[PDB]
Symmetry: C3
Subunit: 455 residues, 3 copies
């Protein structure tokens, strides 16, 4: 029955590929322009917008975007007369829906839509900073390593929860609890009932993330509080600090851009026959054989742009760079050292100086997510100081004292990688890694990237 | 009437040059020795000392320096027999005053004295750290980016105030308030009236720096407190933290050393005819055409010494390094990464190992200070954490809550730079910069420079 | 009489060498294998274990190690058939004691045992991080620069105490005071008298470290408290923060591995004739003439492994890297920038990928510890913030206010640098620092935690 899931997962990868090929024909893009990752993002955004229907389920629309809510589109980049031309294309949302379902043989393929949504979330996590959003909710900016999927749409329920990190959940809870503090009628009446049911659902999702009985117990107390306030906000802050040392269980999905899937179907490949699994070597096989191009701004390093895309494709922004450097075979530097900005090109950017280069998406080894010798690496001092702080004042409980005790005695042993040679297609001989101890361990060390809430 | 100001500003630049030429002839310096920036500083110090008359208005004299208060002087460096010789010269302050007024055609030229004072202030800001002075006044050492002109003399009135930053003002206020806490007779008597009038003047100067109505309002409350104490000190600390995010308006004057002005007049240049403006391209033109040399210690990078002087000449220590790197055309590294120390050579240093090199003071572009596409860059995490802290305990108010609300929701839209080609003398086509995002943004990131209070 | 101490110190250096030569012959190691620093560490551990007799005086034994407490040993590495072989050797502790005393001409040579113990402490200080142990005792992890000899054995006598830093002493006091808070029979009875006598001894040792009258006075109050608790713990935390700015006086002993001493005696050298002094040029002379090899893991920089050993040999982990870089002649990078791990090889590590390289232990200059132009360097911002914090709330006293005043107004352990050609210390060298280098060895530290094993 495990190969039956591989057939269904391959069936939707086939669907994303079939759709992207039709969109390239529809937009009349050359083979090079079809492999441009900037064009792939625009095509992906149109489907999520067409099926969203202003629900904020698959993406988040601009306030301007809601000027003609029956149409969707974005920038399409073409190479004309030795220069890069940008044009704003528009299609009817009903037309885009028709083409998407047509590529999936009449089906809706909600999973195919979700797949591209998580790929966008992984790209935003690897690209943009979230420290300003943490400060608004009264959080420590040093918890940036807990923000998995913090850019997901507001109403992406089932799909988003699996990818969201502990800090992302505490943020959506603190945001919601602070909204209750203002007006007392928030949690009362018919309207209140629905919001209370979502409150208990979010608390249970976050409870499932924690893998210690003490952390789960404190989340139970927060959920049972019929009228939450500043007391629960402080408990959630404390639980966020524990997540730094006593890490929660967060799922990482390796979602590639649509152009990769499309260019593999164009050659000739039946993902429904061969099957497909996001867990093992299948994503690495596609990236080794892939050919993706990207627009590049002046004073940008195309090797750093490649690391940005390669890391987002593997959902590795929150993993140890010393492990990523071993798998990649090249130093995976922290984000602050990257001479690059977002993959997307803003509308105010000038096209005259824009160039393109080949994205380097290959790896020396491949790895399977494992959540048997193990070498465990220490946390950096900012993580240690952010975790063991603020416990000298305020609320106290038997559960807080128990959690702090587990934090102090925290063992080296969670979301690991089993490294194998590319020639070892069947995962015969696991490779014991040999880390370069001079590289930084956190992708967010000295982070200087753009803030997400800028547009 | 705008060209009438250019003629008067050119008249004092002519005066500084005429004076420096006379001092080189007076001291019998070679053409190379006249272009040595160590000699330029000594000559500049003698004028500020001659007209100060122990007022602490243009400089700050050593306690030893007041052993013969009728004379002034310093180290003069000459190249004799393949080595650098240092000698201590002494002149009567009346003689130095006579030579200064003779070069300015009998005038006093107070503006010319101020100009060299601000140039010394900009050099000290770019060179020395002030974290120990911040700790003495109970401040956050991470507010080092608010210490513009923190080395200006205490009794430098109107001219110095325009250059002083928000943190410099909070320091001089807290220093003054703590002396009021100690002695109860402070605000009483003739001294009390004067010191209270200076207190209200400093509060209004700092109030003018802030560009939000809420910040100005809190400064009014601090001024109206007829007997200030620890309550106002805590308000001033909070306002300093707000200045990190809601930046004040501080004036930056590009003041070049006297040797540059002197070497331009020596060739033949009438700054009174052509005019001169510190705002536009005139300082960049002088630096492009300039030829300045500097003594250099062992294990010092002459390129890093050049960045130190070039940054001080443009008063850019408190600006974004990614903008300075674009204008300079070369990476403008943070101060911690500079393999250099102060420009001045201490009296205890050994001359045998001393060498000299050519200062690289040229730039790829020039820029005019503007206080129209704009790309806004995030603050580093130490700035964010220093700004949003300490507000959980202690004082709360309608004004404090309003300021924090503006800080949390602060938009990126704080003085910018307008970049132009050197071939674009009339500022026709503005250049949209392309930053290298791998460079650090703060000149004080990982700061390791000497403390200013050591001598 | 100063040359009489040089003769006795040379007498024990000769003993360590005589012993190591006998151990190489006993273990049948080649000349190369005798110069492998991994073999030297194993040999050194066997002597400390044989004479310890489970006292925790010279080392700290593993719980497994106490499965046959009459024997001792460790991993010995040999080069067989182009590969590195590891074998676990075992010897009777009485046999190792007999071989050690025979090399010192029948004497016990406790100083020689202490010498290798301090060398192990210096290596652990330069290698492993102690931030997790700091958090357990409620301390600031930024006080890592105060942890000299924090890995020394529990019952290490006078010699070990002298090497311990201020933060190491506050840790052993807070640990002990927290044990008194829990159980009250602690300060009562025969145990109570002894444990109280050790408490007053530790307080006086730490009092001697401080070199300001105010800091010494606050330690007196901590000692006189007949029943200490959380009040003294907070006083000790405050005194540790003062040590960041008002540094204490801690002794640093340059102890080289036994293979260095052994390889110098093998050639032929009478340390008892020439004498030996850990203070001056003698350790630098040995390192200049030394030839030491080290096993090296994949993706490790042998130049960084060399810096690790050279720094531990000079007990320099807690000194300014800008001074160490001037003496070394090469940039001495912070520990976070080093592409290396511990010198020792764990039992779970695979020998197939292991290689060896030559340790670069030479220096451009030598220096004598001096505790006359002086150039003083600023503290980094984490040190400043860790020192001036927590004084807004809690306990207050005339002594705390006096110490903070001395900290805020504090004016600027030195090194006197000389050329290698200047053996008689004629011309002191005024250093010329590279101001781009980081000043603290622990800046951005990413090394393994000492307690994990
Ligand atoms: Na970056």
């Amino acid at each position: 029955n495990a190969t039956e899931i591989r057939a269904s997962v391959g069936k939707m990868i086939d669907g994303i590929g079939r759709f992207y090929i039709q969109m390239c024909t529809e937009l009349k893009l050359s083979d090079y322009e079809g492999r441009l990752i900037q064009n792939s993002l625009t095509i992906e955004r149109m489907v999520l917008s067409a099926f969203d229907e202003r629900r904020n389920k698959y993406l988040e629309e601009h306030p301007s975007a809601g000027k003609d809510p029956k149409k969707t589109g974005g920038p399409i980049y073409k190479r004309v007369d030795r220069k890069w031309m940008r044009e704003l294309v528009l299609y009817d949302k009903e037309e885009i829906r028709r083409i998407w379902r047509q590529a999936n043989n009449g089906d809706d393929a909600t999973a195919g839509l979700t797949h591209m949504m998580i790929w966008h979330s992984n790209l935003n996590d690897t690209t943009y900073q979230r420290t300003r959003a943490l400060v608004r909710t009264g959080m420590d900016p040093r918890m940036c390593s807990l923000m998995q999927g913090s850019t997901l749409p507001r109403r992406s329920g089932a799909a988003g929860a699996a990818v969201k990190g502990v800090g992302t959940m505490v943020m959506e809870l603190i945001r919601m609890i602070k909204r209750g503090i203002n007006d007392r009628n928030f949690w009362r009446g018919e309207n209140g009932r629905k919001t209370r049911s979502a409150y208990e659902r979010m608390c249970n999702i976050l409870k499932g993330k924690f893998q210690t009985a003490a952390q789960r117990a404190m989340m139970d107390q927060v959920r049972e509080s019929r009228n939450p306030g500043n007391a629960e906000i402080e408990d959630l802050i404390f639980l966020a600090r524990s997540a730094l040392i006593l890490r929660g269980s967060v799922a990482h999905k390796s979602c590639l851009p649509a152009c990769v899937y499309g260019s593999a179907v164009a050659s000739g490949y039946d993902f429904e026959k061969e099957g497909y699994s996001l867990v093992g070597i299948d994503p690495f096989k596609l990236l080794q054989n892939s050919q993706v191009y990207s627009l590049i701004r002046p004073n940008e390093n195309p090797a750093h742009k490649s690391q940005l895309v390669w890391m987002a494709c593997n959902s590795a922004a929150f993993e140890d760079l010393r492990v990523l450097s071993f798998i990649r075979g090249t130093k995976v530097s922290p984000r602050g050292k990257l001479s690059t900005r977002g993959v997307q090109i803003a509308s105010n950017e000038n096209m005259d100086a824009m160039e393109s280069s080949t994205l380097e998406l290959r790896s020396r080894y491949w790895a399977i997510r494992t959540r048997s010798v193990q070498a465990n690496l220490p946390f950096d001092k900012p993580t240690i100081m952010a975790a063991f702080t603020g416990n000298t004042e305020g609320r106290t409980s038997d559960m807080r004292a128990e959690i702090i005790r587990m934090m102090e005695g925290a063992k080296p042993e969670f979301q690991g990688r089993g490294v194998f040679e590319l020639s070892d297609e069947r995962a015969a001989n696991p490779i014991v890694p040999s880390f370069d101890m001079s590289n930084e361990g956190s992708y967010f060390f000295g982070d200087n990237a753009e803030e997400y809430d800028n547009l």
